[model samples]
Target: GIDPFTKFFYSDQNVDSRDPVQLNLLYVQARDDILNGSHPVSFEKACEFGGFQAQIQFGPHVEHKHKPGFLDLKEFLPKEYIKQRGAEKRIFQEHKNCGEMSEIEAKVKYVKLARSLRTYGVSFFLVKEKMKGKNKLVPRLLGITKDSVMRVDEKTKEVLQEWPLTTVKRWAASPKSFTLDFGEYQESYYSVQTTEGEQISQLIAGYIDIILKKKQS
Candidate 1:
């Protein structure tokens, strides 16, 4: 349910979390900066930075292009990666550059690159839930990008209110009207469908911030 910047946004009469003028400026940049090094937005990230682009991938690509060097693509780091403890683990690994020369040089280069980048940025998260008829866990997108939770009034079956998880934020558990929908290729987008003459609508929001734990492999 990731809505890209190219899809949904426009200025109207409402208080906005971001300046429409500023967002509109970056909207143009998002379209213009594709495949350029300055901003490494991968289609969907532009939406995360939609309003809050100050820390997003906005960059000086040409000025800060320090190379990470010629380490093998299949490679992990050397005997001295994030720790000296990783030295022996490369034995059964596929990387041929395990102990290659210029180890210090490689690490130093990456260090500079890392330090040169922004201090922090948005971290992505996925939701987990079972489909209506199954117990198997899946990535649930009820609330799309930007924690827009539209909680439902269970008794009335109406959308009570909406909130961004970042703001702080429940549900109708309404009559889910998922008539005939097909999610996009990467599941990056979605479409809604319904049988004719059917009252088709799903619970549209909530306030619960999911705190999922990583399970077993």
Candidate 2:
């Protein structure tokens, strides 16, 4: 069960591993994020991502075989793309541009675009926050990018608050909540309720480890 690929690709250090074989895993993660609307993308950009996904799955665009409806329509397109007029055709047309590109090349190109996304190198955790003076908990998205921690609005995915790693004083994750503390007196702090507190804590710790790894060089 412990295959070499999974051993490294799924490990905690996978984010900074820089291994070429993990490109597929990274592409799949990006595809899942794009398809599930985790990372909001424009309609045109969604179709382009679909084109690359198709290119990786089906090789170069072939006229008769790769036409619209040749494969299941739901496989590559995002769920929100259901009713858009000619979206499938547009995706197929976009796939045409990948002509002569091999699957590995398609993966390389797809990952390049994936890295260009604003959510690149970021992980999101959905949680509920109890704001100051508020008795009720409000839904929020917590994002951990390479160098900072961000609190995002759930609906619009906008960054409402951010704490750069350089200023972080301490952090801890309890069974029901994750908390981050900043400032010398630890007066500046934020907390959120989430079931996956341990996972969030581990990911943040791992990222922090890599950040330190960079400075020693």
Candidate 3:
């Protein structure tokens, strides 16, 4: 549903009612762009920056078997857990420092980082559904993660070496998330997970301007 402000704006301007089907189509296109690796934001950065807790553990040494707990190793020696652990601590600390910033300050930092990634061709969105009842959700943004490499193979029939998320996570000394403030015009807020350093926003802004100009033409 369109928000009250939007309704009033359109009404005052005597614009036609927005087409729900068109809106859904836009969303579908956006989601497909994100999932198919064409978005300007990244899912990992979105999750980290938005402060969403990751329920699943990810690392280089953690092996997956066919059966759950059939060869569970974390149960054997708890101290060894830290040995296999990777960037979780570093990511947490980076977020911690940003937590002290005022909401506006945080948004500024997020926008800067997001814009950088946009320049590098990153885009992201939210996954409304889970993957076959699995705890994992599909990537709703384009990124250079190891998972992105896997999807490209699946989507384009191309073979590529799988890059480890841990390696990608370490690309920056500290990574941050993305946040947007619409200033109370809407009920929900927009947030994106992304690394701390990347050139994305400039590209996004430029793309949007071109789009608007084309429309005007």
Candidate 4:
């Protein structure tokens, strides 16, 4: 449950977080991704809360009160819904160690916890680069796939094959949300796998080159 929100397109550059029209669109896409058997992740407040309800719900909340709440990884695991009935329950994702680890390190470690275990395939990993003439940050999708499936570069599309390629799932707003589906990859995962091994920071630090490649042949 690290990052699950899917990015989409918006024309306006100066978008507001609380805009209802945009929000409606955002949630619509979120529902799509969720239905496709993908979730936002344990860290997302919406996903974190109620993730361990009576039946371990994992839904979205408006803004109620204790009503729309729930974490304690170790402690809550055994008690996600193990109360003496009638009682309340809550669960959310928490790091075993948060005090000593730096922000980036902690997050990086968390990513490793999920990414390293898998034998092959990677999902969405966003990257940004300030092109000399661009007005906004270059939000790019870094999706890797297991095989040469029918994938489309959302940014420009016309796909045939390739992993760790860029796409345009969502683009207008919401830094945290977007969409994707990944590979050995020529860009994102390809470089990191070649030398970085399991180092996430290295992948993150050198995101520029990963997202912006010379050209695919």
Query: Which numbered prediction scores highest in lDDT against the true structure?
Result: 2
| CA lDDT of every candidate | 0.28, 0.76, 0.33, 0.31
**Which candidate comes out best when scored by TM-score?**
2
Supply the global lDDT for candidate 3. Answer: 0.33
Q: Tens-digit lDDT track for model 3 on 1-217?
A: 6564433111112112243344334333433343334543333443233321111122112223212233233222122132344334433434444533433333333333433442233333222223446775443332343122112222222222333222222222224444333343445433345552244343334445565577699
Q: What is candidate 2's lDDT per residue for 1-217, written digit by digit as tens? A: 5554433222233332345577778777878887776775567777888898888888788888877567666677667675678888888887998887766667667767777766666788889999669799998888887788888776555678777887888788888999888877457578889998899878888888999999998
Name the candidate, 2 or 3, with the larger TM-score value: 2
* Model 2 score (lDDT): 0.76
Quote each prediction's TM-score.
Answer: 0.19, 0.62, 0.24, 0.23
Ranking by TM-score: 2, 3, 4, 1
RMSD of 2: 8.3
**lDDT at residue 192 of model 3 (Cα atoms):** 40
* lDDT for position 78 in model 3: 23
Better of 1 and 4 by TM-score: 4
Report how far off residue 46 is in candidate 3 (Å).
Answer: 5.4
- Roughly what TM-score does model 3 have, to 2 decimal places? 0.24
Per-candidate Cα RMSD to the true structure, in Å, reads: 19.8, 8.3, 21.1, 19.3
